[PDB]
Amino acid sequence: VPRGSMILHAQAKHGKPGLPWLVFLHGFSGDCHEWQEVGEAFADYSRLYVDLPGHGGSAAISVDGFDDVTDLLRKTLVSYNILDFWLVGYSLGGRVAMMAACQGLAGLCGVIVEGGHPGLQNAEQRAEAQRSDRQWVQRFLTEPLTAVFADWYQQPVFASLNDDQRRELVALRSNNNGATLAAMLEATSLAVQPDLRANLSARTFAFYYLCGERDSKFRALAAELAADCHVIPRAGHNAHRENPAGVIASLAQILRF
Ligand SMILES: [Cl-]
């Protein structure tokens, strides 16, 4: 899609008429293929595998903040004539999902967030994040990505990963435009995201949390939310990648009931 595209790039897959859409949102540096292994177990549903700004086919789409990502999401949904939908988001995508849900997306059935941060409490926690994210923006923007990603996957959230998993992920994410990656990282930084705890409780939509059992960080964060948390065994932050069958199982419990 071009630089100034009104809608995000996404891969649509049609399912049974009358079943809601499953709108899948990848994490930072991923693309629309992220949730395809898990989503394809739900092929009776219509699936929208979105490319977030700066990622995959949405690489040229530029955003200032979350309001812009939400608008784009809204326009993309209208574009595919999606009125009944679920937002299934991993990490950055989970954060995008929660942000869009709390701004208000008409037709939203529910949000399923996997390792998504509900938001930091004060502007001090935000400052610490702005400082750390300003450092990441600079590296993605100027350095070779095989180098930035090797350290990115060395971050505490990815501690649970083995060196073979980190190798495969570094290679996979390095197929990206650092400049557009960096812009999105800055646009939707934890530093600029509000505390969504009250908003995620005072919701009109259904809300479910998924978490790898090894992801102690997001397990504790989930515990603070008014949501059904589904702890995915033998899995880290990206639980759908490490354990796709377990995440399908959890999604089946959620969606097929
Ligand atoms: Cl990842």
Author numbering: -4 to 252
What did the original publication write about this model?
Re-annotation of the activity of an earlier enzyme in the pathway, MenD, then led to the recognition that the true enzymatic activity of MenH is to covert the MenD reaction product, 2-succinyl-5-enolpyruvyl-6-hydroxy-3-cyclohexene-1-carboxylate (SEPHCHC) to 2-succinyl-6-hydroxy-2,4-cyclohexadiene-1-carboxylate (SHCHC) by a 2,5 elimination of pyruvate from the cyclohexene ring. MenH is thus correctly annotated as SHCHC synthase. EcMenH adopts a typical α/β-hydrolase fold, comprising a core β-sheet of mostly parallel strands surrounded on both sides by α-helices. As is characteristic of the α/β-hydrolases the three catalytic triad residues (Ser86, His232, Asp210) are located on loops of the core α/β–domain.
